[PDB]
């Protein structure tokens, strides 16, 4: 019982999703009843009769339980809910209120609600002939349409590393005592010269020299978090198209020894194929939170830029070293998402939704006004997980290769801030 149906152990007691079961589930046979008993409110045969009788039917439907778990990739999208559904000739609950007036004494009104029946619906189809070609066409325009945002963020992240190479000189200046180099960097920041000349402490001069520098980095990390999530949504490429279609059905006998009912229902046969793009080796080691969360990143960034601190009498030198150490740790965590990223998971989900249809009333050939409304309960949901493409055309490695070494140089820089 320690292992749920969607979780798998590991070598280090890591809880990962079982890919053997998550890809292809197990087909479960359904024996229960959904709505076997329906009620009648009305009159028939000029006599008050309210009875309950079962209609035709039968229960054979293969279903699988849904699974919502934590993602298998850091800063990734939720895993696909792979559910297999076998069509059994889906029934729609018939709610039809008909009022007929004919003859001189034959007058009755009854409403048949929740009447299920069986039709002829295509169980399988294929739209890859029109989807796969249109799928590779958006890749050419992706470099022009979204290429501007990609190149813009690459320039904003490189300037952040440059500021990090400059502020290390001011910190170490107090260590060995080279205060001459400190005054050269401070003068290159302010427009004029208003720096304090009164002889203070040795470490207090570092605060005044970095006053505009603290506000600069704060604005960099602020909007970077928003753009970081915007580019993750572009990796999930999903395109599709809907087409019109009509389904004919017959052999309906809901009014026994009174009349028959027919009609037409219009469906929309839709198809869409999604793809996943993430780390090939990323899904090998994960636990139920081991990493630094991002919900507090917006709050913890301003915790050091504000002039008000609670660490003054708490050994600030220890807090400063820990602060930079936590920055490089988070940067290394995000740095593991650009090394080699390739197509890892793929899925094809086909479905047919419901649109507005019309119903024609008739009584043994005579026209009659009938007003009804119906709704859909079950629909086609089969997400077939596979790894393959008819014509694969993608290259994102060199495009993001320039971002990998940037964070690498930063992570190696923080290692020189040890005790």
């Amino acid at each position: 019982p320690k292992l749920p149906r969607g979780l798998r152990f590991g070598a280090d007691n890591e809880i990962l999703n079982d890919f053997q079961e998550l890809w292809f589930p197990d087909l479960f046979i359904e024996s229960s009843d959904t709505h076997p008993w329906y009620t009648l409110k009305g009159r028939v045969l000029n006599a008050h009769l309210d009875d309950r009788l079962p209609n035709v039917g039968g229960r054979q439907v293969r279903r699988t339980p849904h699974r919502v778990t934590v993602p298998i990739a850091s800063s990734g999208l939720r895993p696909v809910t792979t559910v297999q559904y076998d069509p059994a000739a889906l029934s729609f609950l018939l709610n039809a209120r008909v009022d007929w007036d004919f003859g001189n004494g034959d007058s009755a009104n009854l409403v048949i609600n929740d009447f299920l029946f069986r039709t002829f619906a295509p169980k399988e189809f294929d739209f890859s002939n029109s989807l796969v070609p249109r799928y590779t066409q958006a890749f050419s325009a992706f470099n022009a349409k979204y290429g501007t945002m990609i190149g813009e963020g690459l320039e904003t992240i490189k300037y952040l590393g440059l500021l990090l190479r400059r502020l290390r000189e001011g910190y170490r200046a107090v260590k060995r005592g080279d205060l001459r180099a400190l005054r050269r960097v401070i003068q290159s920041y302010h427009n004029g010269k208003w720096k304090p000349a009164t002889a203070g402490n040795l470490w207090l001069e570092f605060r005044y020299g970095l006053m505009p520098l603290f506000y600069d980095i704060r604005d960099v990390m602020l909007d970077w978090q928003n753009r970081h999530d915007k580019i993750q949504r572009l990796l999930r490429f999903s395109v599709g198209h809907g087409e019109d279609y009509v389904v004919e059905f017959d052999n309906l006998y809901p009014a026994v020894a009174y009349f028959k009912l027919k009609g037409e229902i219009t469906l929309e046969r839709r198809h869409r194929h999604g793809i996943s793009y993430a780390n090939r080796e990323g899904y090998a080691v994960f636990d139920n939170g081991s990493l630094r969360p991002v919900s507090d990143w917006k709050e913890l960034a301003t915790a050091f830029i504000n002039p008000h601190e609670v660490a003054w009498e708490l050994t600030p030198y220890s807090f400063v070293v820990d602060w930079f150490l936590n920055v490089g740790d988070i940067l290394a965590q995000q740095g593991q998402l650009y090394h080699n990223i390739d197509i890892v998971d793929g899925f094809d989900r086909r479905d047919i939704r419901l649109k507005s249809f019309t119903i024609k009333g008739e009584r043994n050939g005579r026209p009659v006004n009938v007003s009804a409304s119906l709704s859909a309960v079950d629909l086609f949901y089969s997400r077939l997980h596979t790894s393959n493409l008819p014509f694969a055309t993608l290259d994102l490695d060199t495009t993001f290769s320039s971002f990998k070494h940037v964070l690498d140089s930063i992570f190696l820089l923080t290692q020189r801030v040890k005790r």
Binding site: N129, R134, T136, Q137, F139, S140, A141, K145, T393
Partner: protein, 132 residues
């Protein structure tokens, strides 16, 4: 459907002319397919280009572009190799609206062909004549 060998009968003023076109692949940059006769020199070989399009922020309309390139070989230039002389350019485009229906398009396809078989265009095309 799939790029394939495209055989064509009933070609030229005779109509006994036939032509085959092999799939040349698709340039992914412009997103344009290419077809060609199999000749000796590709520069000499007949070319056929088709393309689709999809509406963008720049245009809300579909474009279907078809271009045909049929050079004129000079067999004896006084040199050992033939050379391109004249280059025939045949260009066809299509515009449609996102709400364009099927039969409308289908209606366009046939009628254009019928015109090409109409006695009107032949003088216009072959003999380069206006409408009189």
């Amino acid at each position: 459907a799939k790029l394939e060998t495209v055989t064509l009968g009933n070609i030229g003023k005779d109509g006994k002319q036939t032509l085959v076109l092999n799939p040349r692949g698709v340039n992914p940059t412009n997103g344009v397919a290419s077809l060609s006769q199999a000749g000796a020199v590709p520069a000499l070989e007949k070319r056929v280009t088709v393309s689709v399009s999809q509406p963008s922020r720049n245009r809300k309309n579909y474009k279907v572009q078809v271009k045909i390139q049929n050079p004129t070989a000079c067999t004896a230039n006084g040199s050992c190799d033939p050379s391109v002389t004249r280059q025939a350019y045949a260009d066809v485009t299509f515009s449609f609206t996102q709400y364009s229906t099927d039969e409308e398009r289908a209606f366009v396809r046939t009628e254009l062909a019928a015109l090409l078989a109409s006695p009107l265009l032949i003088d216009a095309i072959d003999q380069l004549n206006p409408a009189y």
